[PDB]
Structure formats: C-alpha cells, structure tokens
Design an enzyme around this catalytic site. Sequence first.
Site, PDB file in Angstrom:
ATOM      1  N   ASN A  19     -11.721 -10.457   9.027  1.00  0.00           N
ATOM      2  CA  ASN A  19     -11.068 -10.710   7.734  1.00  0.00           C
ATOM      3  C   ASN A  19     -10.289 -12.058   7.714  1.00  0.00           C
ATOM      4  O   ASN A  19      -9.060 -12.077   7.581  1.00  0.00           O
ATOM      5  CB  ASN A  19     -10.198  -9.507   7.272  1.00  0.00           C
ATOM      6  CG  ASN A  19     -10.520  -8.187   7.953  1.00  0.00           C
ATOM      7  OD1 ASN A  19      -9.842  -7.772   8.889  1.00  0.00           O
ATOM      8  ND2 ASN A  19     -11.590  -7.524   7.541  1.00  0.00           N
ATOM      9  N   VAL A  23      -7.298 -12.875  16.450  1.00  0.00           N
ATOM     10  CA  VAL A  23      -6.174 -12.345  17.215  1.00  0.00           C
ATOM     11  C   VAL A  23      -6.284 -12.861  18.650  1.00  0.00           C
ATOM     12  O   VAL A  23      -7.329 -12.716  19.253  1.00  0.00           O
ATOM     13  CB  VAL A  23      -6.016 -10.789  17.123  1.00  0.00           C
ATOM     14  CG1 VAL A  23      -4.768 -10.314  17.855  1.00  0.00           C
ATOM     15  CG2 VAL A  23      -5.989 -10.320  15.673  1.00  0.00           C
ATOM     16  N   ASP A 133      -8.996  -0.825   5.315  1.00  0.00           N
ATOM     17  CA  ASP A 133      -9.996  -1.101   6.343  1.00  0.00           C
ATOM     18  C   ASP A 133      -9.826  -0.109   7.478  1.00  0.00           C
ATOM     19  O   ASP A 133      -9.899  -0.473   8.643  1.00  0.00           O
ATOM     20  CB  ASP A 133      -9.856  -2.556   6.811  1.00  0.00           C
ATOM     21  CG  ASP A 133     -11.104  -3.176   7.419  1.00  0.00           C
ATOM     22  OD1 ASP A 133     -12.214  -2.683   7.135  1.00  0.00           O
ATOM     23  OD2 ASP A 133     -10.980  -4.220   8.075  1.00  0.00           O
TER      24      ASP A 133
HETATM   25  C1  LIG Z   1     -12.618  -3.449  20.262  1.00  0.00           C
HETATM   26  C2  LIG Z   1     -12.969  -4.417  19.150  1.00  0.00           C
HETATM   27  C3  LIG Z   1     -11.745  -4.901  18.412  1.00  0.00           C
HETATM   28  O1  LIG Z   1     -11.656  -4.830  17.183  1.00  0.00           O
HETATM   29  N1  LIG Z   1     -10.776  -5.402  19.213  1.00  0.00           N
HETATM   30  C4  LIG Z   1      -9.542  -5.963  18.819  1.00  0.00           C
HETATM   31  C5  LIG Z   1      -9.508  -6.919  17.806  1.00  0.00           C
HETATM   32  C6  LIG Z   1      -8.322  -7.575  17.514  1.00  0.00           C
HETATM   33  C7  LIG Z   1      -7.172  -7.283  18.228  1.00  0.00           C
HETATM   34  C8  LIG Z   1      -7.179  -6.310  19.227  1.00  0.00           C
HETATM   35  C9  LIG Z   1      -5.933  -5.969  19.964  1.00  0.00           C
HETATM   36  N2  LIG Z   1      -6.109  -5.641  21.255  1.00  0.00           N
HETATM   37  C10 LIG Z   1      -5.029  -5.258  21.937  1.00  0.00           C
HETATM   38  N3  LIG Z   1      -3.771  -5.149  21.508  1.00  0.00           N
HETATM   39  C11 LIG Z   1      -3.619  -5.520  20.225  1.00  0.00           C
HETATM   40  N4  LIG Z   1      -2.453  -5.589  19.516  1.00  0.00           N
HETATM   41  C12 LIG Z   1      -2.715  -6.003  18.235  1.00  0.00           C
HETATM   42  C13 LIG Z   1      -4.041  -6.225  18.078  1.00  0.00           C
HETATM   43  C14 LIG Z   1      -4.654  -5.939  19.349  1.00  0.00           C
HETATM   44  C15 LIG Z   1      -8.375  -5.644  19.508  1.00  0.00           C
END
Ligand SMILES: *CCC(=O)Nc1cccc(-c2ncnc3[nH]ccc23)c1
Length: 280
Positions: A19, A23, A133
Amino acid sequence: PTIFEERHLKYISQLGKGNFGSVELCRYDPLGDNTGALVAVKQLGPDQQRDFQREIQILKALHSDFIVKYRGVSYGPGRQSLRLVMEYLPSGCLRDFLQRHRARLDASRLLLYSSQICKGMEYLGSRRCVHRDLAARNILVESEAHVKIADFGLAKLLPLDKDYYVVREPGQSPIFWYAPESLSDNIFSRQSDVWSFGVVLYELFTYCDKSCSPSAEFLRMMDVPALSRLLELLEEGQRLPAPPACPAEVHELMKLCWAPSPQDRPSFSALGPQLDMLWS
Ligand SMILES: *CCC(=O)Nc1cccc(-c2ncnc3[nH]ccc23)c1
C-alpha cells in the site's frame, strides 16, 4: 522517548512492501556499537503524505495488547514526521508463521489466535476505526500464543454521525478479502471488516496453504472481468468451501461473517464469546 533520531536509526533489512510504502528493519543504536533495540520503521506523493500522517495519528491513539505497538516518530520538515516507528516482532506475519509451524499449531491454538484477532477488532471498532485490509498477512506474531493486528495504511476513522465510508479510488489489496458492498460500491464499515475476518478465519484453518488459498479457490469456482465474476458468485450465494478437516462449528461462524446483508453480520463483540466457548 517518542523522538527517535534518524542518525541513530541504522538499516538492517526490508521487512515488506504494501500500500505505497515500505517497512524496514532498523536497530535504534544511539551507542553506534550494534547493541541497541530493534524497531520496525515505516516510510512512504501529496495524498500519500496526508495518508501517512493519518496512519501515524491512528496507531499512536491505539493502546492494546492485540494492536502493534507504536513507539514514535522520526520527524522531518514540519509537523511532517519523516518516518513511523513500531515494535519489531521477529516471528513476523501470521500467514508465513502458519505455513512454517503448521505441524505444531492445532485447532485450539488457531481459535485462541481467532479470539485475539477478534478482541483487537472489537477494540478497533470501539475507536471508530475500520481497518480495511484485515488479512493473515497483516497479522503479526508476538509469541507462540499471542498475535497482533498490523498494517494500518488503509485504516479510516468513522464520522460520529456515520457508521460507513465510501472510497473514491478502487481497491489495490487482493480482491478476495473484500465484502460485496466494498467490491460493487467501495463501501467500508466494521461490517466489511467482519467479512474480512471470516476470510482470516478461513486462512487460519488452512494454515495459509497457497493451493487452497482465498485467491486459488475463487480461481477454480469462477468475456467477464475477474472482479465482476467474484461479485456475480458471491451475490448468487457461493462461498469458499470448508477448509480441510475444519470443525463444522468454525465453518458456520465463517458463513455468518459472510452474511450477504452487512447489517445481518455478527459483530466482533458478538464473535468473541463464541470463539472463546470453543476454548483457548
Ligand atoms: C510475512 C509477510 C509480511 O507481510 N511481512 C511483514 C511486512 C511488513 C512488516 C512486517 C513486520 N515484521 C515484524 N515486526 C513488525 N512490526 C511492524 C511491522 C512488522 C512484516
């Protein structure tokens, strides 16, 4: 505490992309010696910049064991926070956790995940927040028995005199998680988040297996454009089938989340004790 200095934010890896934004896994290392805590940093556009500040204020106002913890921001030109800082969950997204550890997660373990997502959603609804979402890919794993709602990029607050909102521009997330009112009219509410939940419920009871996934299964049941086909199917009365070995009780709750009229749909505060009676 909430002001993280970008100089002390040291890049590790890409956590994801979805989107418009991204990250990143960073280490908040003010000592510059690789000992500091790991954090998840989100960064992004004119309506995109208004939508980032929207995500920030929403998440900052969210205080729940079932919603990803906001840690703060790393400011820029304003009033305009350059990046959003969240807690890091090394277990990651529930979709791949399910696939990675399926042989170990049983029905009871999945219902506890269901009931936790459910209480998180009941809380979001209480804040007048519609996630839009809700998917297992957007659910994070804190520990073996603790999940959290994440990715609030498309989340919206409902006006105090309104219980639904209509989006101008079309959907960009996978079409299979949307309700028939979201598909045909771009209408979103806590009732369209409930439809999405029953899809999350389907996802848990498949362990997010790609072969029987919400996308792969509609592909089989389906010149007509692929969005209008799903609209046609869902309105007729077609639903995703009961996942392999899924309890008949869990599947019935899925079909209720999938009631065609959105007012008929069960609420999250109504869904919780039912998921909590099946124990764990
Ligand atoms: C497993 C596929 C996926 O959507 N992974 C994903 C995408 C964006 C961020 C994270 C993420 N991983 C771990 N800690 C997190 N804190 C906020 C977002 C996090 C995982």
